[PDB]
Amino acid sequence: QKFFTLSNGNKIPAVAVVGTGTKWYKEETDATFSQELTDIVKLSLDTVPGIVHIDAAETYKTYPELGAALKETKKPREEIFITDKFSSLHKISEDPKSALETALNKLGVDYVDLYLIHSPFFDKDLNIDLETAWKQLEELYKSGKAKNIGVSNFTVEDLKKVLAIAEIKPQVNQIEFSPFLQNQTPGIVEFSQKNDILLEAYSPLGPLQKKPTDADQQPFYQYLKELSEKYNKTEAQVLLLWVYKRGILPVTTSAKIERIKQAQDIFSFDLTEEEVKKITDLGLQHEPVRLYWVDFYTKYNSEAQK
Ligand code: NA
């Protein structure tokens, strides 16, 4: 199992292989509880080898399901890494401190391993701004309820807002990142990496989500097939490892426990310098595909593959 070392010297597992969100929106009412979700989370915790990195979010409304799974697995706490996210775009709690207190209670745990502000755009109805929200995260860091702190979907300019007031500099920024969307907003990857802020990438498998009908003809997809056959791994595995080779943490989820195991096991094989660069270059010659924050960030499309 491989890890990234954040700017504070702490270890985070280099892929996140279980998500705790429903394929559909849920509020939490007992009627809406998904047994199927709690089952897959627990099965994952029980059977996936090494430290299991889970990615969650207040906005999912699935803390119950995750809590039940965390209880009923015999995977010890310290072999689990929970990432959670305060909901800033659409308010569910009063502020991060209240959100996390609620979350700990529902989950029946004492701390999360990483805590993110999910959106740089704050709901009007919040009595907190970004600056004040960050300071709350810094207290949660100091009280040990959040072992690591960061952000999500932040531009360079939004990072600069945080950097200007931060006591504790953000350790992570989780973005949309695939070979077909290589800068969610202008310059984000270059800037983050230059500043020792670890990028996580959600929707890394965008290319396999929207696979065209004449893909047998497109060099990008031909190449991915060629690597799959060389290494005897899935195309998905190759992309997830590509992300890791670009110095970034792929964030993935499946309904299928075998795909979840395969995502953990991307460090069973390796890619060469040449192979990494070729996936990048075939990627960059593809028009940008943006699957999230289309409302907000379409204006940045012209610079997303630049
Ligand atoms: Na999102």
- Single out the residue of 47, 44, 57, 46 nearest to residue 17, CA to CA: 44
Residue 14 neighbours by CB under 8 Å, 6+ apart: 1, 2, 3, 4, 244, 249, 267
- Cβ distance 12 to 6 under 8 Å? yes
> How many angstroms separate the alpha carbon of residue 202 from the centre of ligand 1?
8
Tally the residues of the chain: 306
- Cβ distance 117 to 133 under 8 Å? yes
Cα(85)–Cα(100) distance, integer angstroms = 9
Q: What 3-state class would DSSP assign to 13?
A: strand
> How many angstroms separate the alpha carbon of residue 292 from the centre of ligand 1?
7
- For residue 253, the one-letter residue type is T
- Per the listing, tokens 């993935």 go with 252
- Single out the residue of 73, 92, 84, 160 nearest to residue 120, CA to CA: 160
- Cβ distance 243 to 266 under 8 Å? no
Whole-Å CA distances, 42 to 22, 86, 223, 253: 15, 23, 36, 14
The alpha carbon of residue 108 and the mean position of all alpha carbons in its chain are separated, in whole angstroms, by 22
- Cβ distance 84 to 115 under 8 Å? yes
> How many angstroms separate the alpha carbon of residue 124 from the centre of ligand 1?
19
Task: Note the resolution in Å, 1 decimal.
Answer: 1.9
- 3-303 fold: TIM Barrel (3.20.20)
- Which residue numbers belong to the known binding site for substrate? 118
Q: Which method, experimentally, gave rise to this model?
A: X-ray
Q: What 3-state class would DSSP assign to 116?
A: strand
Residue 223 annotated in active site: no
- Which residue numbers belong to the known binding site? 118
> How many angstroms separate the alpha carbon of residue 59 from the centre of ligand 1?
9
Which residues are paired to 18 by β-bridges? 54
